[PDB]
Amino acid sequence: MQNDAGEFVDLYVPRKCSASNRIIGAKDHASIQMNVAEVDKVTGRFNGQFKTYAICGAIRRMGESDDSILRLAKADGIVSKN
Amino acid sequence: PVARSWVCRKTYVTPRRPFEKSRLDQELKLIGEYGLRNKREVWRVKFTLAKIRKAARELLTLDEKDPRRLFEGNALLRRLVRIGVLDEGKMKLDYILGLKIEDFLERRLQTQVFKLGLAK
Amino acid sequence: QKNGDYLCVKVDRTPKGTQGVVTNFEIFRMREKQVPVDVVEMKETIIAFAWEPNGSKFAVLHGEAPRISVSFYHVKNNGKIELIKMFDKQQANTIFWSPQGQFVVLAGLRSMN
Amino acid sequence: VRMNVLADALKSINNAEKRGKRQVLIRPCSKVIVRFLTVMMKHGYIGEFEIIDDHRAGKIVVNLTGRLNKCGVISPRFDVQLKDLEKWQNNLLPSRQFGFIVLTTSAGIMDHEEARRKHTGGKILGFFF
Amino acid sequence: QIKKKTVRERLQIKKTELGAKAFKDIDIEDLEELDPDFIMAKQVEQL
Amino acid sequence: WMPVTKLGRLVKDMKIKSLEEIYLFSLPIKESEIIDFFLGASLKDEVLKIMPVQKQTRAGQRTRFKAFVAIGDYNGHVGLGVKCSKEVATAIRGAIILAKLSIVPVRRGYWGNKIGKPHTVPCKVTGRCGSVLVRLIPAPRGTGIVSAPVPKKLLMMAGIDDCYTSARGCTATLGNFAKATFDAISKTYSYLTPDLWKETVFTKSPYQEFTDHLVK
RNA sequence: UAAAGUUGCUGCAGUUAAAAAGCUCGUAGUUGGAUCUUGGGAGCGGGCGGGCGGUCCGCCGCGAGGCGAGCCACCGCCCGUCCCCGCCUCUCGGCCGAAGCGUUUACUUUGAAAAAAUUAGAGUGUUCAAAGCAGGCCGCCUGGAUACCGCAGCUAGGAAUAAU
């Protein structure tokens, strides 16, 4: 990763899951990266800024992508707090 | 009871897989370049580099202020800078492991008579 | 050397054995003990030579009239010599050596400019 | 029956970490496990936890960010002298650059690099990497 | 969006980078003022 | 070369500038001239085995030829493709196409006292396919690849300078042994080291950014 | 002997591949749940890291001292780190070195004693080497080191983990 001259010697830095923080590899072909759009607070229209979440495929295969998208959208102010 | 010494060792190690074409290719290239006579003259230089690297590979698993490390690493790097295969600035023990097998074949007297212009 | 320390022989020799067009200096050491001889090679031939009077430096200029590049060597009393600075696209081929030390004047003044 | 409580606690951590869960519940609670999970927390591997007090041997609820590849036990607790520490960290760890062996020494429960810096050895407890 | 697209195609960040490059060039020039004084000082102390 | 994929129209135009943007988002590579586009002059293959496999019918036996091919650019890149077809040159050609489609990057790491350039796998990785379990171990600088000949080809192709190996099982069936070594070295970019603990920033996708270029 | 993870303590296996007693009870053996001082400032020194004044080059004023270029080298300071001790036993011998003793052991870390030869290993051009203990400079100078030697015994520092 980082040798003694301070150089970053890796080929690339892979993404990590937003739900489990596992390394989404090169060939994890079931993993997603999903944009969820923000809206403007006064008009309720899409203003160009995003929220980005990534889920690896092994979480998706056991049916747990929905609840983690609900928790991650709840904690960044998209889903209400009831 | 005799006044003798029977102390001797062998100075080469015969390879395990005898007919691998890549091993035959590289060692025959070293024979033809450096003017050796047979493959035992290559394997002896592989044995002395293997003994050097086994000594450094033993010392490198120690805490760096244990005094066996601080004495014998300085002696081993001093002998490698003395024969010339490790240059004067880079006297650190991690640079022993970057010795290729063509370092000790350049410092023979036959190659240093050919490189110093004393033969055709 | 202009204090008599070192003797460098510049050759127009390329080897007949190797194809490679390379020249060598035999540097003796006369004032040091038992006259050591050291070799220092170049990929090109030289058109000039300079030995420093009373200095622990050396200036060596190699190449053709469009390609004359000088290299300033620093040769200690005990050890070997090396190359410090090589300059691309230079024509400085005339070296006036001063008696003061620590300064070299390098001119490209032979017969084009 | 239940022997060596620390082993069954670390197998609970490992089975609930491999499924990507976020919180485990450990039962019972030794004072061995609280120093062990202190050691794993101080290296930034598990985060905070709680020691739930009933008046019996308590429970422990651990937060988990999955950073933890394997959390294991060594049973029985072999005596590791200071010359046997390199033979043990060559076997269990995945690298010379990371991974830790926890071992219980007379200065306390500590990992394997601190035991070289404090110049002491003792019995092994397990590992985490 | 068009101003963001024009800035991305061209590349405040570029102006700050140009100012930092100009400051680095100015710092080298001031060191040359010390050195040309010092090379003149090298002439003066010798003579 | 007319591309058919969205990735192909991003690659036969200068919109994706390196192969790790395609690996970085796990975009599925489905045509083999992308690997000829990016790696180019540095792709050397070597054929591992040509085995006859035979199907019994009332028409006698019906014999196929099953080829294995490794490929690679020796800093990071390794592929292995198996393609079984009726003529031997057809099996070798299809295996070279499939070997280009399966190229993964290798994360290479260090032994202790990490000066320089990375020379081994970063950690002990294990891969299993069939019954063969092939373990790759980090090694010191300058020990060579201590292995069997079939994973010595796969580990010398990926740019790994040094390794130590231990292999279990019936290793003589070459397909599982090379597939298990390929599962061993495709796994180093899924192993969570402590230096990959740093929190990720997410950038725009290639199809998200080049989508007003692509609609033309 | 390695290959033999085909003797497996590290490191094998038992549904069908060779393979788990027909089934419980049971002494020796082997293993055995949590629990009893954790806390919290403080400074001493030895290093760790940053910074500061000085040693440092061009210039101000004769000059003190410094100003711009620092931390490449050396000296001390300012604040945070990895080790150390302290507030929080008693008989009495020249403001206590000395000394009456406290449940045991297992563990660990130091220290003693451990035949040389061999084995790692330092020095040294037997013409290189295997060896050898020699040798070196124009009467003189200098080597003949060192480390490991498991278990049991002996010793003083530690008191997490384990039995009583």
CB contacts < 8 A (D, F): 27
**Residue in the block written with tokens 């790790």:** F20
Quote the distance between the C-alpha of residue C50 and its chain's center. 6
Q: CA neighbours within 13 Å on the CB side: how many for B27?
A: 19
Helix or strand run (H / E) with residue A74:
helix A65-75
For the CA atoms of F30, A18, D61, D75, the dihedral, rounded to the nearest 10 degrees, stands at: 40
| A64 and D CB contact within 8 Å | yes
Cβ of A72: how many Cβ atoms within 10 Å? 18
CA-nearest of B42, F94, D84 to D103 is D84
Q: Are F159 and A11 in contact (CB under 8 A)?
A: no
Number of domains within chain A: 1
**Please, which contacts does B42-45 make with residues 24 or more away whose CB atoms are closer than 8 Å?**
B43/B12, B43/B13, B43/B14, B43/B15, B44/B11, B44/B12, B45/B101, B45/B104, B45/B105
Q: Which residues contact F66 (CB under 8 A, 6 or more apart)?
A: F50, F51, F52, F53, F82, F83, F84, F91
Q: Which residue of F has its CA nearest to D68?
A: F192
Separation between Cα atoms, residue F67 and residue F87, nearest integer Å:
10
Three-state DSSP state, F94: helix
* Closest residue, chain B, to F153 (C-alpha): B22
> What angle separates helix F174-185 from helix F149-157, to the nearest 10 degrees?
30
> Residue A71: in which H helix or E strand, if any?
helix A65-75
**Whether the Cβ atoms of residue C69 and residue C90 lie closer than 8 Å to each other:** yes
Q: Under an 8 A CB cutoff, do D96 and F191 touch? A: no
- Report H helices in B18-98: 21-34, 40-59, 67-83
Token pair for residue D126?
């397990």
Is residue B78, in this structure, part of any structural domain at all? yes
Nucleotides of G under 7 A from a protein CB: 5, 10-11, 31-36, 57-59, 68-69, 82-84, 107-110, 118-123, 129-132, 145, 147, 157-162
Asked if residue B10 belongs to a domain, the reply is no
State how far the Cα of B63 lies from the Cα of D114, in Å rounded to an integer: 12
Same domain, D54 and D112: no
**What one-character DSSP code corresponds to residue B104?**
T
Residue B87 in any domain: the answer is yes
Q: What does the block give as tokens for F42?
A: 């540095």
**Helices (H) and strands (E) in chain C — how many of each?**
0, 7
Number of structural domains chain B divides into: 1
Domain-embedded: residue B7:
no
Span CA (D127) to C1' (G157), Å? 29
Same domain for D126 and D104, yes or no, is yes
Residue B71 resides in a domain: yes
Contact (Cβ atoms closer than 8 angstroms) between residue F8 and residue F101? no
Phi–psi pair at C59, nearest 5 degrees: -120, 120
Q: What angle do CA A9, A12, A16 make, to 5 degrees?
A: 125
DSSP per residue over D12-62, as a string?
A: HHHHHHHTT-SEEEE-S--SHHHHHHHHHHHTTSS--EEEE--SSS-EEEE
Domain ranges, residue A74: 1-82
D90 touches strand G (CB under 7 A): no
Distance CA B1, CA A64 (A): 83
D107 touches strand G (CB under 7 A): yes
Name the experimental technique. cryo-EM
Q: CATH number, domain at D52?
A: 3.30.1370.30
Q: Please check whether residues D59 and D77 belong to one and the same domain.
A: no
Domain end position, chosen among D22, D43, D68: D68
Phi, psi (deg, nearest 5) at residue D52: -80, 125
Residues spanned by the domain of D63: 1-68
Measured distance CA(B38)–CA(B20) in Å, rounded = 17
Non-local (6+) Cβ contacts of F83 within 8 A are: F66, F67, F69, F91, F93, F94, F95, F97, F98
Closest nucleotide to the alpha carbon of D92, via C1': G10
What is the bridge-based pairing of β-strands A46-55 and D122-128?
Answer: unpaired
Nearest to A30 by CA among A7, A61, A4: A61
Residue D87, CB, less than 7 Å from strand G? no
Local structure of B66: helix, strand or coil: coil
**Strand residue runs (E) in F74-144:** 77-85, 104-105, 125-129, 132-137
Nearest-angstrom CA–CA distance, C97 and C104: 6
Residues on chain D touching F112 (C-beta within 8 angstroms): 96-97
Strand G reaches within 7 A of the D40 CB: no
Token readout for C111 is 């017969």
Q: Where among D19, D50, D68 does a domain terminate?
A: D68
The pair of three-digit structure tokens given for residue C14, joined into one six-digit string: 């390329």
Cross-strand pairs, F146: F164
Q: Pairing relation of β-strands D49-52 and A32-39?
A: unpaired
Domain boundary, last residue among D68, D83, D101: D68
Alpha helix stretches (DSSP H) within chain F: 6-11, 20-24, 33-38, 88-101, 149-157, 174-185, 206-209
d(CA E12, CA E18): 10
User: At C32, is the secondary structure helix, strand, or coil?
Assistant: coil
Q: Number of CB pairs < 8 Å for B and F?
A: 17
What is the distance of C-alpha B33 from the center of its chain? Answer: 17
For this entry, resolution in Å reads 3.8
Residues A17 and A55 sit within 8 Å (Cβ to Cβ): yes
Q: Which 13-72 residues of chain C touch chain B by CB within 8 A?
A: 16-17, 24, 39
Which residues of chain F lie closer than 8 angstroms to D44, CB-CB?
A: 197
CATH number at residue D120: 3.30.1490.10
How wide is the angle at C-alpha F195 spanned by C-alphas F194 and F199, nearest 5°? 95
Name which of C34, C70, C76, C38 is nearest C57 in CA terms. C76
Q: Write the CB contacts of F209 (distance below 8 Å, at least 6 apart in sequence).
A: none
* Tally of structural domains, chain D: 2
Residue type, C104: V
Tokens for B23, please give them: 């091993």
Contact state of F123 with D67 under an 8 Å Cβ cutoff: no
Give the tokens for residue D99: 């991974």
**Residue B89 lies in domain:** 18-120
